[PDB]
Structure 1
Amino acid sequence: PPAQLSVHTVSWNSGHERVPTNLEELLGLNSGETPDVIAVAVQGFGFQTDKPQQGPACVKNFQSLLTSKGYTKLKNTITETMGLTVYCLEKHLDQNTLKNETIIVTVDDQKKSGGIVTSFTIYNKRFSFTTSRMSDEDVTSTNTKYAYDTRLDYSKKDDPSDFLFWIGDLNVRVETNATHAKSLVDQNNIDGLMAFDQLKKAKEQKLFDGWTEPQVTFKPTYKFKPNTDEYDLSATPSWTDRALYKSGTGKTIQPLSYNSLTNYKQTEHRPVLAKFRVTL
């Protein structure tokens, strides 16, 4: 039992975009780090109805890279609008204790909104990875637009997990006008703009209770004109893709790094990469 383990997470509201050439950058492996656990969350349209038939390239390309580095894919789950994959180094796995489990929650009769939770145990400590997706317009169990449901929160369990991560587009936005938002961004006043971000409002309403976001130092990750760094001001610049963390059991989770990946420009949203060190 190591005293500590590292986790990398990435999410991207990637829409219809395809596997990039440079997956090492996407996963935070380009400076030679070797995280114990990797989670990849996507939001978009048509993943199960793989009409472009891009599923096979995703599997080939991710598998080729990660197996060579000593990872086992614990689970990939795809719905029409979400994807969640969790990888763990083979060396940490004990089949008799792993207890690998995934649930899918859907909130609407078309199965477009909800979330996915994948959980597993290593060294007798339980990890859970959540992603979620909600539309602006739906009726919800919270009567808010935010992509929260108690069923996706394993910290609310009678026996809550040791290490929990929630990654994706939480449907949290910057509640001010585009002019004022752009001005803040031009001044690099990230904390000033974050003052208008809705995560705190969701928490006042008792959603994402006790979940922590690492400090944000990067500019809003949406909405860009593709293949530029120029905001499309038809939307107020916002932080779409987020990483939250919690422990149910008093374990220390230390963010090492939290950043958008500005080199992935192909789309309106920029992926977000988080790195953590967890103490068992």
Structure 2
Amino acid sequence: PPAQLSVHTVSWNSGHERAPTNLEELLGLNSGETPDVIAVAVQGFGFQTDKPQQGPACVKNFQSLLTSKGYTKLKNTITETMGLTVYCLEKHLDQNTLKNETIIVTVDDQKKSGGIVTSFTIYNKRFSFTTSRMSDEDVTSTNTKYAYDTRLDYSKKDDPSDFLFWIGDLNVRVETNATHAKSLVDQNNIDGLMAFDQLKKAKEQKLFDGWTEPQVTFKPTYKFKPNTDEYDLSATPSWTDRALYKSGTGKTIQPLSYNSLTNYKQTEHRPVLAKFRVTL
């Protein structure tokens, strides 16, 4: 039982885009770090049907890179609009106690909104990783547009998990006009623009209760004109992909870094990579 473990998470509202082939950077591996757990969440369209037949390349390329580095894929789960994969270094796994479990929650009859939770235990500590997806137009258990449901929140369980991460596009946006938002971006007044971000409003409404986001120092990750760094100002620049963390049991979770990956310009959103150190 080590004293600490490291976790990398990445999420990307990737839409109809295929997985990139350059993955080390996406997963935070390109400077030689060797995290214990890696979670990858995507939001988009057509994953399960997989008309593009891109599933095969995803498996090949992720498994090619990660197996050589000592990772085991605990689970991949896909729906039409969401994907969540969790990897862990094989050296941490005790099959007798791992209790690897995933649930899918769907909130609409077309199964386009809801979320996924994958959980597992190592060294007698329980990890849970959630992703979620909500539409602006949906009727919901919260009567909000935010991608929260209590069924996805393993901190509000009778026996809450030790380490919890929630990654993806939460459908939280910046609630001001585009002109003001862009001016704050140009001034690098990130905290000033963050004053208009809806996560605090969601929390006031008792969504994401007690969940923390690492400090944001990067510019909004949406909406870009593809292959550029220029905002498409048809939308107010916003922080779409987010990483939130919590412990149900008083364990320390220390973010090490939290950044958008601006080299992945293929789409209107930029991926967001978080790195944490957890104390068992």
Give the alignment's TM-score, normalised by structure 2.
1.00
> What residue is the counterpart of 1:56 in the other structure?
56
CA distances 1:230-267 after superposition (whole Å, capped 9, x unpaired):
00000000000000000000000000000000000010
Separation in 2 of the partners of 1:146 and 1:67?
A: 36
Alpha-carbon offset, residue 66 of structure 1: 0.2
The percentage of counterpart residues that share the same residue type is 100
Separation in 2 of the partners of 1:42 and 1:21?
A: 15
Separation in 1 of the partners of 2:10 and 2:25?
A: 10
Equivalent residue of 1:56, what SS? helix
Alpha-carbon offset, residue 19 of structure 1: 1.6
CA distances 1:187-243 after superposition (whole Å, capped 9, x unpaired):
000000000000000000000000000000000000000110000000000000000
Alpha-carbon offset, residue 70 of structure 1: 0.2
Separation in 1 of the partners of 2:129 and 2:41?
A: 9
> What residue is the counterpart of 1:274 in the other structure?
274
Separation in 2 of the partners of 1:274 and 1:42?
A: 14
Separation in 1 of the partners of 2:158 and 2:20?
A: 40
> What residue is the counterpart of 1:194 in the other structure?
194
Alpha-carbon offset, residue 18 of structure 1: 1.1
Separation in 2 of the partners of 1:52 and 1:197?
A: 35
Equivalent residue of 1:64, what SS? helix
Alpha-carbon offset, residue 22 of structure 1: 1.1
Equivalent residue of 2:210, what SS? coil
Q: How many residues align?
A: 280
Alpha-carbon offset, residue 178 of structure 1: 0.2
Separation in 2 of the partners of 1:129 and 1:64?
A: 23
Alpha-carbon offset, residue 21 of structure 1: 2.2
CA distances 1:57-88 after superposition (whole Å, capped 9, x unpaired):
00000000000000000000000000000000
Separation in 2 of the partners of 1:272 and 1:143?
A: 27
Aligned counterparts, 1:131-280, within 5 A: 131-280=131-280
Separation in 1 of the partners of 2:103 and 2:265?
A: 32
Separation in 2 of the partners of 1:50 and 1:23?
A: 21
Separation in 2 of the partners of 1:236 and 1:185?
A: 11
Separation in 2 of the partners of 1:48 and 1:17?
A: 14
Separation in 2 of the partners of 1:252 and 1:143?
A: 33
Separation in 2 of the partners of 1:96 and 1:201?
A: 42
Structure 1 alignment gaps of length 5 or more: none
Separation in 2 of the partners of 1:192 and 1:19?
A: 33
Equivalent residue of 2:24, what SS? helix
Give the alignment's TM-score, normalised by structure 1.
1.00
CA distances 1:77-112 after superposition (whole Å, capped 9, x unpaired):
000000000000000000000000000000000000
Query: Pairwise CA RMSD of aligned residues?
Result: 0.3
Separation in 2 of the partners of 1:19 and 1:135?
A: 23
Separation in 2 of the partners of 1:27 and 1:97?
A: 27
CA distances 1:4-63 after superposition (whole Å, capped 9, x unpaired):
000000000000111212100000000000000000000000000100000000000000
Equivalent residue of 2:112, what SS? coil
Separation in 2 of the partners of 1:21 and 1:55?
A: 13
Separation in 1 of the partners of 2:43 and 2:228?
A: 21
Separation in 2 of the partners of 1:225 and 1:200?
A: 28
Separation in 2 of the partners of 1:243 and 1:114?
A: 17
Separation in 2 of the partners of 1:153 and 1:21?
A: 32
Which aligned segments of 4 or more residues in structure 1 are displaced greater than 3 angstroms? Answer: none
